[PDB]
Ligand SMILES: NS(=O)(=O)c1ccc(Cc2ccc(C(=O)NO)cc2)cc1
């Protein structure tokens with residue numbers, strides 16, 4: 001199989017006698033296929049930055065094992081050559097402490113695996129607008145990736161109401177260093193949606209939020225280049241192309 005970097009893929013396997021699914025060390029969780037009772041699914045994701053050239057997964061059954069090979073593609077993402085160089089940014093201690101603390105808080109959440117669906121059918125978009133900046137835009141020195149846009153931006157004047165893309169539980173609902181006012185929602189099975197740069201937050205940590213319910217108003221918090229909504233999806237432990245993942249998830253779970 002082939003997969004473009006920064007994308008997720010739904011793998012399908014026989015349910016009967018299945019014991020586990022592995023990638024070296026790492027176990028990969030599985031969930032039911034919602035339409036076919038003889039199948040199970042797993043989500044597999046390639047990082048954007050520095051992915052392997054190929055990946056070999058193994059599914060262990062009682063009777064036998066099944067090898068899955070996946071080749072990484074580069075895709076056709078927009079990229080610009082960086083001119084300066086990263087050097088390294090030297091922020092003041094107070095900011096470095098804040099960033100490092102927020103990072104830890106995020107990793108703990110992103111590696112919680114909720115083994116049931118908290119969603120309700122298909123994802124919807126968080127507002128009815130259009131994309132102003134795409135997933136995957138890269139900056140390169142030495143044709144190696146220095147940075148990339150890890151979500152997608154939708155046009156929004158400050159104050160545009162923003163709606164949950166699907167049901168779940170809120171896990172983050174506060175001002176954070178680069179993200180501004182942030183909401184992150186757990187949808188189950190390790191799928192998280194992300195809403196950044198809000199001017200207002202209307203939900204609370206631990207709250208159960210239904211699809212289409214209001215979660216805030218858009219703003220420009222944390223942003224240099226003007227107001228906009230940044231929407232992200234993290235799944236299989238990585239940031240992935242949100243519109244790509246939404247169309248693949250919906251093809252399977254549309255009620
Ligand atoms: N540790 S932290 O402060 O919570 C933290 C660090 C990095 C990021 C990634 C990120 C941020 C903003 C944007 C963006 O809006 N593009 O328009 C995209 C990605 C998110 C949160």
Ligand SMILES: [Zn+2]
Nearest residue numbers: 151152153230
């Ligand atoms: Zn963005």
